[PDB]
Subunit: 218 residues, 4 copies
């Protein structure tokens, strides 16, 4: 399961633990009970979601593999209730891969410069920066220093392990028009995968708990 994002980004599902019934099981222990049947168990998921009983959803866990620009990753990595491992500019020579916005990204803004020219100006500056980076590397400057000239639109890659409760918090905050458009796009892909693996939890989340605006439209 892999969804392409932006010009060179992606969100890929690496692994998952549990499913909707993992949450049902965890909730039912309060009452000294276990699973029942489809109708009552699905009903329980809705009940939990509607009354803010969120801890049972911590027992569903995902691992994603994400390729995203650094400015997006910086926003994403603010979610502390999660696990991350990322590509290092200290330890790796970084690839020529940068997020160049499409002209349509500037739709809705009156600019004194054509959108195509904005695109071009972003490209020029990344090209120069990357060339400088390689030059510094070639001349013996350690990578950890050479990379400081690279722009925030450089692509990075990381593993993200997150449980369904924290993932819902992420969707609330990132699948939302107040978040930057670029991370909205990533959050939509996260939502798609979530919905696929946990359809009852996802549906109940949208119906009762989701606070953002865009998932109910798309």
């Amino acid at each position: 399961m892999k969804i392409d994002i932006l010009d060179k980004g992606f969100v890929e599902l690496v692994d998952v633990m549990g499913n909707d019934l993992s949450a049902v099981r965890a909730a039912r222990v309060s009452f000294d009970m276990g699973l029942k049947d489809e109708e009552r168990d699905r009903h329980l998921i809705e009940y939990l979601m509607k009354h803010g009983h969120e801890t049972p959803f911590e027992h569903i866990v995902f691992t994603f593999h994400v390729k995203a620009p650094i400015f997006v990753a910086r926003q994403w990595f603010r979610h502390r209730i999660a696990s991350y491992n990322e590509l290092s500019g200290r330890y790796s020579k970084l690839s020529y891969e940068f997020y160049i916005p499409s002209p349509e990204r500037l739709e809705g803004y009156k600019t004194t410069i054509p959108p195509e020219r904005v695109t071009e100006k972003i490209s020029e500056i990344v090209d120069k920066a990357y060339r400088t980076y390689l030059e510094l590397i070639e001349s013996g400057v350690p990578r950890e220093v050479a990379r400081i000239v690279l722009p925030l639109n450089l692509y990075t890659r990381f593993f993200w392990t997150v449980n369904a409760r924290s993932l819902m918090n992420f969707l609330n905050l990132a699948a939302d028009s107040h978040a930057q458009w670029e991370i909205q796009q990533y959050a939509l892909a996260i939502a798609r995968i979530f919905k696929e693996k946990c359809p009852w939890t996802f549906e109940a989340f949208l119906k009762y708990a989701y606070k953002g605006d865009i998932l109910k439209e798309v």
Copy 2:
């Protein structure tokens, strides 16, 4: 569902697991823009990570356990905040007649003025009386959340525990150790057995390089 019986009526049961040793290798390798290699180099990397304290890659391995334990043991266990819990409620459920009664051998090493068998019996008596009072209060219309306050700390409870391998290693350091109470040591031994089974390379490296306790040897 691996299941290990603990104490007189307790258990630790494995409910689910995500990932394995290679999940940690994969997560660590991304720093170098790399993925998996081969058995020798990958196993070597696990040892390397363990010996240098690079622990974040082990967070991508996750377990869900189902545990039945006495409340005094659960109170110690639930101090591990880097984990997820859901537990049986004395507010919402009528609690069962199940208590941890120590065996006489539990007092081995202690000189007691009362035979160990008699200590066992005294503990039994007091739980029996407390439980009887609990039922009586319930039967008379006292809400469960109040009636249960007379029940002793050796009452068995049950919970689900979801925990990643990093936090699980911290748990083993602290609970699989002679300074911890004997009862939780027993639970920690079972958690270690399951961990070793699911993550043999991580477990072996952990024991060699990082494990701080004294009983897992």
Copy 3:
């Protein structure tokens, strides 16, 4: 600041870092009453909660074990508690007042329920002392003690996590006993962070009882 709770409990404020302006400063990233108080309301009403993490409290709490077990489920906080392994425990137990059963039709008078709870704690405690006196280690002897035994702990918590605690514990769905503790925590919070507390009540608080009971 110390507030008595239940028959022998209390919540005591031990220390605090910061005040309403600590949140303002963090939201602004810097260093009028009207503009700063307005910002606190703004943050609260839009769910910008991270700035309130820079206000921190340390409480000292004496509470029964069943209450502490509920309280200690709040993982975004710091705790240190008295030990039954390392200390001889005191004869102190929460005995409900008869009024605790008001609203419930019991086949036994409420005063008799009170008595029955007392008896059983007295017998359990006596058994505990007998076991200790006979050479049984404390960590085993204490397992016969009931859940209403008082314990004590230090609790260090920031204002964001504290607000989550008030949402869940200062609420009629929570057990009455912990509601009482939550009311005291609210009173201290309101005293130290009046603007944050007021804004919280108006815009973010999800519970029911802090709107029903003053302070």
Copy 4:
């Protein structure tokens, strides 16, 4: 307390809750100097770290983004940072001194490396301002800015997590730039919590640079 770091950075102490005795109080659940200091050592030596969570600091830090990205990986803490979405960003970038590289054999003089870094930041910043001036929203315009751009943040952290930070950042394996920040954090920690700091160095600190300063 404010310590300058790198060419334009700093670490400033904003607030603190508690002191060494806050940890002693918590471990005891309650001043005798010798016994209380001895308890701090005892806790440190046996890995009883939770009592140090009751000491808390708030710092105000100015650092380059590549340093902040490393720092912000410490999840057991609180952060609020300047936004490139909401603010026009200032012309402030970390330009390494020539001495940062002297000790690496480079085919280009260190002074020329410095100059090449400066040129590229200057061009990037100019492009940024141009895009802003032409009506491109800030959140997009800023994506051309390099990783050595300075940012500012508040950091609230307890002594236990702060010790973990010192273990990992006040250490030669960490990038030199964040080592410099960690040294300043250590200085402020030592000043406010001398007993904890001394016991930490003696029994628990795993890094290599703080015993040399």
